[PDB]
């Protein structure tokens, strides 16, 4: 028993890291097959930064003006194109350790776990969401851009997240791999605003499930609540509202603990109007709510790669 | 910026585990050179374990009753020994995959990864303190005895835990890897006891360093104190009393903020004295122990391996 923020075991994932260095410039890529994907802001200067116009920042660059570095082979860049915020670098190898994989665009309310890198090396691994507002709450300083999310499905891994920055109130905005930012962020120097950030409700439900299994359940009642009734309360919360179709995501954690969905949820309605009177949830005094259904359930049943 | 509870990346270690079968029992071994190290109690039924009498039972063993896969390979076992709570298992390849390595016992208030697995396969990596009575708040489900906790250092690994047992409360138990367990504690299947658990009172203060560097500062207050004054009001809250040992080992901390040791421990009894007020601190409403002054600085100045 006992239930943790835990990451993927991510070396795949670093079998794949490299450093890559544009002029005064290194951060971080991913080098797949003989492609190796990185911010576009490797180009740039430091002043370029506060407006850069990336498409003439890179015509004047040469394929040799990229040096990528995987442990200390020096890699041959042989191409170069850039896809909205991220730049392909075709090399002249194909990186032995590729693993299985997919580029996938994640939901808001998903997790995945992010490999914070600095000169294309590892140095740790986290558990993140994204947030219905389109940040992560995340731990990346200067040099880490480049670093990647990514959930392990048995063999595959599937890559959600590359890192570009951070905005002014201490959260972090990045892209797919496909280079598209998630939310309305753009790579500038620039004070950017995220959304009003809400709580996902059906994540609170699964950790609320999770505390159950482990020993936490004095917050469990003897009223019940229709799903309109708890979202009237949640609203007034700043919670998202639950569909049927999160009631559905939820039924199996109900019915391996026969703790009916809209039970759970009138728990949490009483959580919400009262707080917790001095008891903590799994080792915390605050509702969380960046472990998914899924989350949960891996945790609880063991599930391996 | 941001702070996070950061595992090591777990590459290195996912290369060297292993599934480990005797009987109707199998859990993961560690596979490092040609020796593959897991718990005793590998070797027992389920009644054995009420009261195992380990030395009798290994007897009834013999090379061929212990089933080793790396991955989907059998390895052959040649050879078998106890020393303390694990069975060391000689096989007959050594691990292509092991890394530069040592064994440690670590001391209480220090951090570990722990790389989760069941059967051989990694199902998720997380960050433990070893806590001052020599348990650990981990996440453990059956079969995942032999699980490793690990630090490393550049290129190499230093073992310092192996997962046995859980406690009544909840937390767990395990050894070093000469198969010593931290604390009092017997592998079998009888209720034992923790002693009182207490509060790293050095991590606390790495944390609140780590908070400040990050934004939230409300707490900072203008007042010192003394070590003595200090540790009159911690042991009031049982917390560990403050040395000058630890105060020198947060001196680095104190430098790279400009905040002295003894003007944190000034907050910190503060913060002890009249609660949080309904703030929270790195997005917690409890003061985090679990991080050390080495984790933060490693943290939030970017240390790779
Ligand atoms: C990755 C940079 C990198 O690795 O390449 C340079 C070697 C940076 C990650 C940041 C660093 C601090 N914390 C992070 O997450 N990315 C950046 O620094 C961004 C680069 C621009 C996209 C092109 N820039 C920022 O993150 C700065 C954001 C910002 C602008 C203005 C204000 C105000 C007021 C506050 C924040
Ligand atoms: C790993 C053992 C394993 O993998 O073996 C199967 C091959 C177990 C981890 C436990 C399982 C539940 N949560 C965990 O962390 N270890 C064990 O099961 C221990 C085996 C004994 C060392 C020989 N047994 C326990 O951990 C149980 C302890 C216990 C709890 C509560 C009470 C009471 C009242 C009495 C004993």
Redesign the pocket.
Same mark, same amino acid.
């Given at each position: 028993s006992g239930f943790r923020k835990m990451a993927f075991p991510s070396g795949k994932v670093e079998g794949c890291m490299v450093q890559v260095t544009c002029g005064t410039?290194?951060?971080?890529g991913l080098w797949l097959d003989d492609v190796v994907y990185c +911010?576009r802001?490797?180009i #740039?200067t430091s002043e370029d *930064?506060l407006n +850069?116009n990336y498409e003439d920042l890179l015509i004047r660059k040469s394929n040799h003006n990229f040096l990528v570095q995987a442990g200390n082979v020096q890699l041959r860049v042989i191409g170069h194109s850039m896809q909205n915020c991220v730049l392909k670098l075709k090399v002249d190898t194909a990186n032995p350790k590729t693993p299985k994989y997919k580029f996938v665009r994640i939901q808001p309310g998903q997790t995945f776990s992010v490999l914070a890198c600095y000169n294309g090396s590892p140095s740790g691994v986290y558990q993140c969401a994204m947030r219905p507002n389109f940040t992560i709450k995340?731990s990346?300083?200067?040099?880490? #851009?480049?670093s990647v999310g990514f959930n392990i499905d048995y063999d595959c891994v599937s890559f959600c997240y590359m890192?570009? *920055?951070?905005? +002014?109130t201490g959260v972090?905005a990045g892209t797919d791999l496909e280079g598209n930012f998630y939310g309305p962020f753009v790579?500038?120097?620039?004070?950017?605003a995220a959304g009003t950030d809400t709580t996902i409700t059906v994540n609170v439900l699964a950790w609320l499930y999770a505390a159950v299994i482990n020993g936490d359940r004095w917050f469990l009642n003897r009223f019940t609540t229709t799903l309109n009734d708890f979202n009237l309360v949640a609203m007034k919360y700043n919670y998202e509202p639950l569909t049927q179709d999160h009631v559905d995501i939820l039924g199996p954690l109900s019915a391996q603990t026969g703790i009916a969905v809209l039970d759970m949820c009138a728990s949490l309605k009483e959580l919400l109007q009262n707080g917790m009177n001095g008891r903590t949830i799994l080792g915390s005094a605050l509702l969380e709510d960046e472990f998914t259904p899924f989350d949960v359930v891996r945790q609880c049943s063991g599930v391996t790669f």
């Open positions: 410039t290194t951060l971080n +911010p802001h490797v #740039c *930064m +850069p995340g990346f300083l200067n040099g880490s #851009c480049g890192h570009h *920055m951070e905005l +002014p972090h790579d500038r120097q620039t004070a950017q």
